[PDB]
Amino acid sequence: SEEGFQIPATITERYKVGRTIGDGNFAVVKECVERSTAREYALKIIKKSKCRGKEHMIQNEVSILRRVKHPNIVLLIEEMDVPTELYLVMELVKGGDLFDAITSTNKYTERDASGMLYNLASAIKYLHSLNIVHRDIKPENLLVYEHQDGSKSLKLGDFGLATIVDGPLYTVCGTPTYVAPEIIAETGYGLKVDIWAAGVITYILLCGFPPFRGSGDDQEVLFDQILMGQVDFPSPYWDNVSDSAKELITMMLLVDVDQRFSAVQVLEHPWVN
Amino acid sequence: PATITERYKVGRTIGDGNFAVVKECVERSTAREYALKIIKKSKCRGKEHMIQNEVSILRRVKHPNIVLLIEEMDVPTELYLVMELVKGGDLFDAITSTNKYTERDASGMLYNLASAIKYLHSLNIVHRDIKPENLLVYEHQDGSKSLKLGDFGLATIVDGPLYTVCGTPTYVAPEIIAETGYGLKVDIWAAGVITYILLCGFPPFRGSGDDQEVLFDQILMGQVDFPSPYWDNVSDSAKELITMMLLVDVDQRFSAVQVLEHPWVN
Ligand SMILES: N#CC[C@H](C1CCCC1)n1cc(-c2ncnc3[nH]ccc23)cn1
Ligand SMILES: N#CC[C@H](C1CCCC1)n1cc(-c2ncnc3[nH]ccc23)cn1
């Protein structure tokens, strides 16, 4: 391949591997056609070795992907473990990621925004029912599934940081823009860090900028805003948005974790029907 | 950055890796030698941004067998960590230069590592990446040598079973592979694997290039061999301790305290 992975003959036999559609650290995603059926799939190639000497490391993503199926979550079709790399065959999603879509159309209507939150809150409710926290919910990790109808669903991917919650966690991880206060505070966190992330994304969908923005002074500013957690809906940007939307986003972006909506409560809110 | 260039004369790279470089630096005012760790956060040739966990832990820990954090300068591009300098290189390099060590030198090194671990476990911190590459050789004036635990990238506070599958296969505990819940004692298993390598020069659980599942099944069953002629010289004491460190039963497996109370490290 372009990057220089030695593609196993087992893979090349079954699949024709196409162009790269997703790039990360120690992982690439490619288009690929199954030779028998002519059906299009996503091939995710994960490097186990760091390629920094023989610094062989272990992957956690596939433990999670095996035990989950949902319309609004990326689907693992099968896996090929090779000494060098882990190869995941997954359902292909052709509409790109939510980050790309937001940069293309600054804002979204409440109708389009609620539909996307309905999809994301559905994925999160399912994961949470299995005590799985994602810990990396962000636009770059939400894939746009385009229906023939013209309608668009979101599919959640990148379960790299996903784990099972059996009591409070303390690992400091995620993207600062989307990270919950209790992660920064290091007082312990669980499933509801995902609700916070979803609240931040919903806010961005409606106005085109995040609720907590850093400064050129320092990065401690962004973290100070998140810890304070005062959500503002400034004019003129939020003038023509409903109170209902503002209410829901508020309930998702509460520092008090017991008061912060669960995924069930988001889904029961009138703004998502 | 200017602010760092002012205080510190940054010398050569002494440690390299993914998203991180460690360089020798000297504080100009005091002529004091330090290690400068530069952690790039973006690492995506783009606007992508990620948070750093190592620093939360380093702030909490002070121990003679743990690398000491002196100060942190958070520039928007990268994070800078000034840390205690250890000039003796990593234990991996040390093992590759000296095939195997005497029992006395090995028990010495396990004393240092079990001391670090005991300290961390008393603060409910699991390290989760204990391996030769992450152990630094402190060279005393006497010419005696200590170990210092270096990288806390995967380190966290434990309040109930963890499930995240992480670490290096050679040193990974069976409960991590089994996905049944793990805690502090994954560090004891790692320490057992290292002790075994120190005495014979090879790991107790060895993989087939053809099948790495042979490695994991060995780990899962705790199939520890003490083969001849390699282990002919080594005492029953060393073999018995390693045995208690590499037990699959987490409840039976030695704590850091129990390792330290073992005659072989006394
Ligand atoms: N989500 C997310 C981020 C992820 C990148 C990060 C690591 C590999 C690429 N990614 C997955 C895809 C992707 N695109 C299209 N179909 C897909 N199916 C499964 C993953 C996938 C693209 N980027
Ligand atoms: N331990 C460990 C692994 C780590 C590497 C992995 C991330 C940066 C380099 N590393 C730290 C050092 C090091 N060497 C000498 N003095 C030091 N002080 C603090 C870290 C350090 C060398 N490699």
Residue numbers in the entry:
A (entry chain A): 376 to 648
B (entry chain B): 383 to 648
Kindly provide excerpts from the paper associated with this entry.
To provide reliable structural information for rational design of inhibitors and to further explore the mechanism of action of ruxolitinib, the crystal structure of the DCLK1 kinase domain in the complex of ruxolitinib (DCLK1KD·Ruxolitinib) was determined at 2.1 Å resolution by soaking a threefold molar excess of ruxolitinib into the AMPPNP-complexed DCLK1 crystal for substitution. Expectedly, the structure adopts the overall kinase domain architecture, with an N-lobe and a C-lobe, where the inter-lobe cleft represents the ATP binding site, which is occupied by the small molecule inhibitor, ruxolitinib. In accordance with the previously reported DCLK1 kinase domain structures, the DCLK1KD·Ruxolitinib structure displays an active-state conformation with a DFG-in conformation where the side chain of Asp533 is positioned toward the ATP-binding site and the Phe534 residue is in contact with the αC-helix of the N-terminal lobe. In addition, an inward disposition of the αC-helix positions Glu436 on the helix to form a salt bridge with strictly conserved Lys419. However, the DCLK1KD·Ruxolitinib structure shows dimer formation not mediated by any ligand mimicking the phosphorylated form, but still retains active conformation (left). In contrast, the β3-αC loop of the dimer structure of DCLK1KD·Ruxolitinib is flipped over by the large movement of Arg427Nη (18.4 Å), resulting in the concomitant shift of Glu515Oε (4.9 Å). In details, the pyrrolopyrimidine ring of ruxolitinib is sandwiched between Val404 and Ala417 of N-lobe and Leu518 of C-lobe via hydrophobic contacts and is oriented toward the hinge region to form two hydrogen bonds with the main chains of Glu466 and Val468 with the distances of 2.9 Å and 3.2 Å, respectively. The nitrile on the propanenitrile group confers a significant affinity for DCLK1, making an intensive network of interactions with the main chains of Glu515 and Asn516 on the C-lobe, which is in a similar position with the interactions for the ribose sugar of AMPPNP in the DCLK15JZJ·AMPPNP structure and with the side chains of invariant Lys419 and Glu436 on the N-lobe via a water molecule. The cyclopentyl group of ruxolitinib contributes to the tight binding by occupying a hydrophobic groove underneath a conserved glycine-rich loop, or P-loop, which connects the β1 and β2 strands.
